[PDB]
Amino acid sequence: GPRARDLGVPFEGTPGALNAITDVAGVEVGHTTVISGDGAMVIGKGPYRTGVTIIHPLGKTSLDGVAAGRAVINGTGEWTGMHLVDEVGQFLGPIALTGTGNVGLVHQSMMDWSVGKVPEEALFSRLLPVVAETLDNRLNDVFGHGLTRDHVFAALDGAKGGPVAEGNVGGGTGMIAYTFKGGIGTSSRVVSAGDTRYTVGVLVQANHGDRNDLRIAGVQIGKEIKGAWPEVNGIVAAGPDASLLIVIATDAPLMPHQLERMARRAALGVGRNGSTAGALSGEFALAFSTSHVIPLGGKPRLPAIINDTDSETMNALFRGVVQATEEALVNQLVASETMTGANNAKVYGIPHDQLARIMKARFP
Amino acid sequence: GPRARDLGVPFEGTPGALNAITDVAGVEVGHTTVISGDGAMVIGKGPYRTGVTIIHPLGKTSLDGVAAGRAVINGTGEWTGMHLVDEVGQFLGPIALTGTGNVGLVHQSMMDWSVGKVPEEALFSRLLPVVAETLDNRLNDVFGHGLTRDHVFAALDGAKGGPVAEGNVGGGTGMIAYTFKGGIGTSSRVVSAGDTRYTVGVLVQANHGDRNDLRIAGVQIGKEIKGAWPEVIVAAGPDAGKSLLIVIATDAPLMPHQLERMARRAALGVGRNGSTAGALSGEFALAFSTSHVIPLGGKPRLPAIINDTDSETMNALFRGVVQATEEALVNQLVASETMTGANNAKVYGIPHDQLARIMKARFP
Amino acid sequence: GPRARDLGVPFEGTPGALNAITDVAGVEVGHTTVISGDGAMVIGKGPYRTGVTIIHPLGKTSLDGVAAGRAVINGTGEWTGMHLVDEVGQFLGPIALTGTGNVGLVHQSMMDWSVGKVPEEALFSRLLPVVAETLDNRLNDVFGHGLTRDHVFAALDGAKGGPVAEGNVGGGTGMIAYTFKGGIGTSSRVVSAGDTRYTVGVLVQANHGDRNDLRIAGVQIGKEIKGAWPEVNGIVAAGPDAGKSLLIVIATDAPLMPHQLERMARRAALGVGRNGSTAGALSGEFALAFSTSHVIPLGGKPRLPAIINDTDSETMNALFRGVVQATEEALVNQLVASETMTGANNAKVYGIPHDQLARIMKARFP
Amino acid sequence: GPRARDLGVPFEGTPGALNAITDVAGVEVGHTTVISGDGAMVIGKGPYRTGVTIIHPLGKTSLDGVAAGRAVINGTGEWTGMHLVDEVGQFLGPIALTGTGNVGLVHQSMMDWSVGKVPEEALFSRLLPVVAETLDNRLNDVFGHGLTRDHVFAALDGAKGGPVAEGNVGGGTGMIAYTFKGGIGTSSRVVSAGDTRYTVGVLVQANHGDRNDLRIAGVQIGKEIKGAWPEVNGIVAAGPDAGKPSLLIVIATDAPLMPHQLERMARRAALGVGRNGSTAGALSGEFALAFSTSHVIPLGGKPRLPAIINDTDSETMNALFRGVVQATEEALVNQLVASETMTGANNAKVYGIPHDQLARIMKARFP
């Protein structure tokens, strides 16, 4: 299927080979997507439109930590393991992105996953799993235990490198963004820092924004698109006729405080596309380095060291985050298809035909 | 049983009637304590020495939020709901304190508890439960699913005002503090601001510190006590070989940024008692107001307002936090009895007879 | 002179009457602008292109505090009084925006200004003045003591409500933004929160960004403009043919608590993001938000006329969108107000060309 | 004169040779102390009891930055250069500690000082000087311009290693702590992490706390001391007979720590403060800054990090943490003992903690 560039959307910069977070070597991504039932919602009985996305920073068999730093745009949401990141500048184990109702289940499942796989001696290092959420309340039976431990195990064990599936998959399955269908999006940039070229990879779970504010390549496109407003049982539920999780990977050998700076750049990329951070929109960014690794109980490994005042190197990386974030948000929208879920709520994927026509007229 | 004051330990300030967090009107506390099995530990089979402690800021039937603010001494640990507190200055629902292995189970159980008790329209407000941990790894089968949803429901439903049980109960059941038995401790202060009086209440789950650093009423006491070292064969002390959660309640009508100030005073009380915050010791404080309340979807209720630069009022409140924290820590030690747990690990409660003898000699 | 709207640049939302931070009642703004000397720079002898901008949140005669909260985009810069804002959620006295070399002189001059004007009893409240900077190093003799205490007194005493002068004035005098002339910019929004309408006002001192990244009304405009690259002694100093920090102040009359004003300040980054910049490593980019209705009388009881729920999306989102939109427009207003300037060492920086900008906007938004 | 240990106060741990922040090699400290005038205060005329203390992390000739991190106990005060530290984990130039009224003068004087000493190319790196304050309002003419640019130059240029003067000197000159005379104090700890040894050095400018809360070596000593309450306008101004006739903490270490790790060190200062009993007043600006002298960043160059430490290495980190706590605790008591009785503006009088009584109490408590 076409991604944003394939529909004529222009972006600045140079993407990695895959144009995805897996352009950062060693990163693995997995999804479990849970879609079942239709019609009226009864708590405990669906319909279900949910799932979980797993990102292994160093691959599924790693017991080591990665240097990490975070940022908050608006903190109305959950992201576990973050006190640890703020304190010691690293986290162990995978990142899980999921629906709000699933957080506790995913948290305990990740602990269970370690039993038998991890030397008893290292088990305590597996006790602060990283799990984050956005709310799939319009399309999904949030409280109804739709996600199982097996679902989580499958995503953990199935994760891999290579091309990353986008759209209505994993944690993004039942999400809604800019009043269109939400979901998973990803992008990357290769950035020239003098004689060295680093990779910055971004993955988003998007559940934020209003259509009236949306900009794609700077075009305020909500009013240019006709129809495609959400419905219920065949009635227009929004418009004139009636949260966001950002994961940043890089192979640059950054220290934790430097990774906080990377994470703070995500907001600028979000700003480019028009949203204004709603009061209850939990918008967060987490950045990690795959070259600055911390062997369990060992000496941190830092292959090179970068000066924070080295503008040539840092600006290249910063611009990478902003561009990759901007593009990941548009890739998400393009990858997400129309879906009908709980209570016959219907949310449209941004129309490909209309988008391509608008881009062609604006950028001949 | 005797508490610290009853063994002759002197403290500064004026305690409330119960000398406990429930001296703040409307606050309720419940514990479920899980103690079963003996001998060699097999993961999934126990022995179990764990549990959960619940604090309802406004009582178990409240759907409203309380104003809140937090502080971190050392962030190697988990406390959920804290991004929410940082962002909007309030949290909904109860505080749960538990062992590290139980966090996800407790988180999902709190969601389940709300189903059928809370109106469907208000269920989304129950999706960011507040759950915090310390690790009971020496005495408890941490990964072994010893805590059940029924255990969590019992603490939620059984919580009440009045005197609070301390020692080897609820979340503190399997904990270790200052190389003695750890657990739950609580204390309160009634403070004067001119003609106005307020209550500051403190509950701790203590799992921190080293015997050689411990001070009680300023006395470096670890070297004065004879024996009582842990056995794993003595595992510490001269004969070897032969985290902290602080919850602060107040009826003072404080704004969120003011409650952050209250939370930051906890460290000073901790410091009085000698510990130095170990590298992996997750030490956190959370403060809330029972008079600044936010009805769900309604107008915040702030009955009076306090100036941050009003030293007479603020200092009284700050000193309250420091003193109640100091005493809560000592009350914990005195309430906790000797316990044998997983793998026959044995941890002694600080000896009452020696403690009272030392205090009598120091404070004739 | 024309502002951004007058050149055909479209923006979303409804501005207040003045389209300026002074749309928030009681706010006063003053500038002192220092421009002297030409040619080669000698430290201590200019040329000088610097100054100071004063914002009195409740007017120049107020001794009271305003509720306040801040945010950092990239903290490579100075903004004094901010530990106080983080701790107790208010600040006393005026905000001063200036050049980096002037910070200490301004800080002490603000103390001196209080002597004789403030009851001795209240003097201690004047000891944590609020002073922020961006660096005018290309056009100005930074270390050369060009700004005097009299300059600072003049801005403090001359500040007033009504229309606010923009461009190469006050703290903005010698600044450079998006490789064009930088300076002061301002805008406002009146926002509907149910049955009440609040005002959000923004003033910026802009010294940030690159021409290649710049977006105006979403148009990547750097490559559309012909010429106007900076020069030295007649030599192009940037762009393809070479060789031939940001301070944001947000005022609102919404009765917000300090933690809520932190939320307002965190919205500024989103409006900056709309215009394309990516926050350079040494670009000190900061925002400070205050409420003129939540006031704290010195040694008295705080005055909070009404109270707002953080989870009330209708009210909070209106305010947040106000910050984003006013920030975006303030930044474009700055560029349009700022004229071409030659300063220290014959460094020449062009104001964004009005004729070209208007032609591009007409072509994009018929 | 005597330091705390000399009066029989016991402390835990092993101090460095100097028992001072300068036990960290290469650190230099300088003071300018301004004491002039007597009697009634007139703004602009004194009397003056103020000054400035300078700490060069890598010595007065260094153009390089040091890795750094900070912590706030109560942020009602000023400390410039701290947004920089929070953002990029380092600061350039010296630390200045001074009285509140002097902040702007010191800030500009530090810029002036660089002109002529620093290559024009590197001048921009001198534009975010680090300056912090506590308020000497009871003893000093705060607004009266008692501190001059020459005073600041003298401290910058006169700074050195070796023993550090304590008490009523430099920025601490006019200060008040625990209702006794405040001022400068310093202490150090040499800590063991396996076979490796590191030094943690602490310097304080103390202007905080109440006598009723003070603990020395765990002993609540305010009520045990007889007399020595302050006097203003001739009458006792505090204590049972009243009516009748902020804290700056600087931590240096030679351990090669990253910026986030130095934030952890700075957050340990609160525990050492807690040991001595204060509860952080509403308007008491209490701050800590920690820096590494081995993790250095050459101007416009590659950072130099000679070794690297795991945050989860308890043996190493706990040794360093305990060092901060113990050295902070001792530096606070060393201050009190070093500071002598002073009469200042308006004939306000504040007593140094009495040495004879303190020694007697320690002897009785610790036979």
Ligand SMILES: CC1(C)S[C@@H]([C@H](NC(=O)[C@H](N)c2ccccc2)C(=O)O)N[C@H]1C(=O)O
């Ligand atoms: C249901 C709402 C009121 S909450 C908001 C939702 N926020 C989140 O998902 C937060 N992580 C979160 C906030 C509070 C509780 C649990 C999760 C979103 O991003 O969609 N959407 C609103 C709404 O649709 O009206």
Ligand SMILES: CC1(C)S[C@@H]([C@H](NC(=O)[C@H](N)c2ccccc2)C(=O)O)N[C@H]1C(=O)O
């Ligand atoms: C056993 C404790 C309760 S005591 C404490 C520690 N003892 C040791 O570290 C001993 N080397 C040791 C001996 C046998 C097994 C494990 C460690 C001490 O000295 O303070 N650590 C606790 C614990 O391990 O849970």
Ligand SMILES: CC1(C)S[C@@H]([C@H](NC(=O)[C@H](N)c2ccccc2)C(=O)O)N[C@H]1C(=O)O
């Ligand atoms: C097992 C240890 C290495 S972790 C530490 C323990 N920290 C916590 O409980 C933290 N919340 C936490 C930190 C990391 C993972 C999970 C929980 C404590 O306070 O007892 N004690 C050590 C040890 O005994 O040697």
Ligand SMILES: CC1(C)S[C@@H]([C@H](NC(=O)[C@H](N)c2ccccc2)C(=O)O)N[C@H]1C(=O)O
């Ligand atoms: C001179 C520079 C290296 S610093 C940067 C400048 N940063 C600031 O003004 C900061 N507040 C600041 C940072 C460090 C010291 C003093 C002020 C800017 O925004 O223009 N521009 C660069 C440059 O022109 O190459």
Ligand SMILES: CC1(C)S[C@@H]([C@H](NC(=O)[C@H](N)c2ccccc2)C(=O)O)N[C@H]1C(=O)O
């Ligand atoms: C005079 C101090 C050093 S003592 C301390 C305070 N005393 C009082 O506040 C007295 N009511 C007072 C008497 C005369 C003038 C001002 C206050 C106390 O009890 O500890 N405040 C200090 C100070 O103000 O500088």
Ligand SMILES: CC1(C)S[C@@H]([C@H](NC(=O)[C@H](N)c2ccccc2)C(=O)O)N[C@H]1C(=O)O
């Ligand atoms: C004069 C006071 C009201 S302010 C306080 C003083 N605070 C500071 O020095 C702060 N850095 C500061 C706070 C506010 C403005 C300027 C400095 C202290 O530590 O002694 N003592 C009080 C008082 O004596 O009553």
